[PDB]
Amino acid sequence: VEFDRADILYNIRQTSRPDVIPTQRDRPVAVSVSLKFINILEVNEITNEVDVVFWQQTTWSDRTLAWNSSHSPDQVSVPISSLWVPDLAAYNAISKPEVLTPQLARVVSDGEVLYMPSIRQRFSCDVSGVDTESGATCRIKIGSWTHHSREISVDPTTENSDDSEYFSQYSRFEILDVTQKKNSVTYSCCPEAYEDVEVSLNFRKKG
Amino acid sequence: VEFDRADILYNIRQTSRPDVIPTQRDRPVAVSVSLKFINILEVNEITNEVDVVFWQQTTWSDRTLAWNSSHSPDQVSVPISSLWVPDLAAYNAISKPEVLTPQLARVVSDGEVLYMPSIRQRFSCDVSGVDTESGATCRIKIGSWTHHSREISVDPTTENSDDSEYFSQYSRFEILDVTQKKNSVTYSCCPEAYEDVEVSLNFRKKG
Amino acid sequence: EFDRADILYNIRQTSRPDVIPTQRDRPVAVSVSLKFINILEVNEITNEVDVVFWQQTTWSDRTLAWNSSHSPDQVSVPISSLWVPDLAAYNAISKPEVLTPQLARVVSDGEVLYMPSIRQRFSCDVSGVDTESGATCRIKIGSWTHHSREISVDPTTENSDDSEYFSQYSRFEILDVTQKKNSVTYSCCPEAYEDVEVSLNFRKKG
Amino acid sequence: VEFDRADILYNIRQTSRPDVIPTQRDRPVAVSVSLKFINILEVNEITNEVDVVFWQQTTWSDRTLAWNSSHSPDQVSVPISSLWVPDLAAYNAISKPEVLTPQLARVVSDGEVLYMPSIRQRFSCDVSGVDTESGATCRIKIGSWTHHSREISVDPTTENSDDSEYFSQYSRFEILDVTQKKNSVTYSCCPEAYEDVEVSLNFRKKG
Amino acid sequence: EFDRADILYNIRQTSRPDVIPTQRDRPVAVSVSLKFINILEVNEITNEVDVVFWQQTTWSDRTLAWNSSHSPDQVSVPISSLWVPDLAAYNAISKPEVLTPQLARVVSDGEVLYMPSIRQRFSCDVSGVDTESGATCRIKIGSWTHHSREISVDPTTENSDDSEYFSQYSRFEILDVTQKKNSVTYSCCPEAYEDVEVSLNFRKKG
């Protein structure tokens, strides 16, 4: 054992610059974002508002975190306060994200970071048809609040898992389909393009 | 690269004095304030209260932040906790501003600062006529809480985009017009003048 | 001589926020004035009000003073860098929700002005709220832990309209705001605690 | 003046160890606990829940705080963050204590500490009979969460003042009697005894 | 030899709260036991419960140990000075509201006993709550970020009654509480994560 977990964590806390985006060769930090829906708690077809629980699965690389793990543990759990974390925000959120879980990320000796908080949050989106067979399709847009496409690129995750694997069987609602579209948007507010992942939650009230 | 992003951020955090208004020449800090409405969530015509979501687009100059970017990135995102930010408050707010987004501002190498939080907040204003064709006109006044007109001037941005560019299509309400104008008010409390931007939100319930 | 950065640096390095600025063993004179902005919710059954007010607080702290003959004579300072009086409303039934930036204004002679906008609920007399005479809700504000030899609490000068800053859009209207200074000795402690009692006479609009 | 208030507070701030229980001679710290009821805000006889405002009058001795006051002030107010405070909890509380008042205690030059926060808190207790002449009797148990009887002893106080001395005349309810009594309980979780003060609030809806 | 001041000073100076106390590359054995205190609100339509429980948590951290042959063998330490397991209820729909002082008990051999009283809301099976058989609500608690080689989670051996500490004033009553140990592999992740599944069998009182 070259570096034990105490040495690894000590090195990360002393030298991780949480305010510094881990950019490489002036390429954007590639952030992967995938929502795994856990619950749909409250739906209002009149106001077009949903209250939803989801895992915001977030991965990226930060090579300033890397260590030689040939004779050491190759992974540690790190408080996010000690790490740079992408400034992701859901564009159509109408409440502050309530993080339900310990605020720790997993860091791998090659600098990959995985962070997957469970968030409860309310959204403004299309709720029409929720009580039909076709269901409603609520779209959630997540992207960097302040980093444009040359600094943060945002891409949807890789595909092997079912959409309902994590979803509560006790919810009043059921998931029909979940698709993760990718957008690069240039707005009037700002000259640069901002990338987002658009998650389409097709869901319906159980019969 | 002369200064990479780590160097820029290091220099800012070591020398930015967040308590210190960046007044130059004994001229006021010119603060630009523009509200971009995102949603109108709840309206009560009996109590004259609205619950609204808006981007509080705030720009100002802080020369102590400037760096030589001839061979360096000319922009970085910085936690507002490392910067002086204007002490702006909505005068007719009846709840604490709920900041929905990451608390980062964008700083340009010439010292210009761009801070645009998405805020949910409740306001006491005129809701009468909300369910008519003319609609209601809700006025929100935003100014510095403690800096008078010789220290902070407050001005509405030049208005280029439509008032609904970022407004939710799923809101029960629609925006008819938004106008911004500045005031300089002497109050009886204090002998100086305090500047504000008055935002008039003309809106109505959809038919 | 001193720019704002120097003044704020000096204050931040030498202001002792835990230390009451008593001088000659006289009480710190704290002026308290409530300016009502809104009355949000009223319940005549439970005798509870929800209100928005500016808690205008002034006092002197000479350890803050600087020579301003060739310098700015005022700066805004985070209250975290300043001693602030431990004032509490005796009949509050919620924590004070401070709506505004936590900054005070400090003048070069050491006079501090702190005026947070606060939303807070109170237990008080709501009876008669829907009559012409209105209800009279009394709010008592005093130092939680400093007795009259350490903090004296005085109502400021009433100079303006009592509805000067009151919302025209409130369901309610203000008939009169009066501010008075009581001097009480309670069964807890052989010494005296000062408070300002604010009487808010208000009614539902017709 | 030998030590002014600045010197006293400086000395306390520098040497008070707020994480260290002030045992002497391996005797328990004697903590006095007395509730003074200010208001009864909400009562539910169906759920057996009450919402109450009370002063939690707490006194104890901490000799590491003492100073020579022969020529100095014999009392100061001190942020509780600079003092050790007893880890008291109400056993049947169903909400976190909402502390309404500034978080300062009073310290006397002999090391006697008095801390009296005004607390709003909800309780699970017997609400039956609330709307009868006999009234309801709601019992609240307060003791140390983690210190057993050899480390903290908890005792009530003396009935100098009436039970409704500070109780709101504007409450929907009235206090008939308060009794505060000492308990020492050995539970099954833990081989030690934990002391508590059990406050019995006899109260009724006004007629 | 060491008074409580010395013990706490040594812990505060050397306890590394971000460092998991793995030994010989064996997992930290974390014991988890829920003691239900109250069931506050139940909704059979939404399948949601609001519950108060003691989250009794124990583990060993030998970097906390001290020689207690002539010293106190136990102290209470703020959790902020200790490593605590990153436990999370998988079906919680609200943040855990910790009702109690955030202190743990540390024994001189390095055993930590942390038992917060927690109010939390859960999504689980509420059907049958108003029948004699009652509802069975299952709550799963495991480490959020540590797999089975780093943290093992096990139900504690508990002689004490299910209702030992449950409120007699609750609208509900407890019929049975079982605890059960799982280990799962999810698609997201190569490794296995351990949890304790607590089955709360409960019903509305008649």
Ligand SMILES: *[C@@H]1O[C@H](CO)[C@@H](O)[C@H](O)[C@H]1NC(C)=O
């Ligand atoms: C990693 O460390 C080991 C020494 O334990 C060494 O064998 C190897 O060279 C290192 N790999 C590098 C430097 O990439």
Ligand SMILES: *[C@@H]1O[C@H](CO)[C@@H](O)[C@H](O)[C@H]1NC(C)=O
């Ligand atoms: C910026 O730096 C360059 C060298 O990188 C220098 O030539 C130029 O004078 C600098 N700008 C200033 C100090 O105005």
Ligand SMILES: *[C@@H]1O[C@H](CO)[C@@H](O)[C@H](O)[C@H]1NC(C)=O
């Ligand atoms: C303030 O500074 C001025 C100018 O330097 C000086 O005349 C005066 O002595 C100072 N005030 C005092 C302490 O008398």
Ligand SMILES: *[C@@H]1O[C@H](CO)[C@@H](O)[C@H](O)[C@H]1NC(C)=O
């Ligand atoms: C307290 O201080 C006075 C002198 O200021 C001294 O006479 C007395 O001895 C001191 N108390 C003791 C015994 O520590």
Ligand SMILES: *[C@@H]1O[C@H](CO)[C@@H](O)[C@H](O)[C@H]1NC(C)=O
């Ligand atoms: C604890 O101290 C005692 C003597 O006070 C000693 O016998 C022993 O070496 C110490 N710790 C161990 C290794 O058990």
Ligand SMILES: [N+]
């Ligand atoms: N999980």
Ligand SMILES: [N+]
């Ligand atoms: N995870």
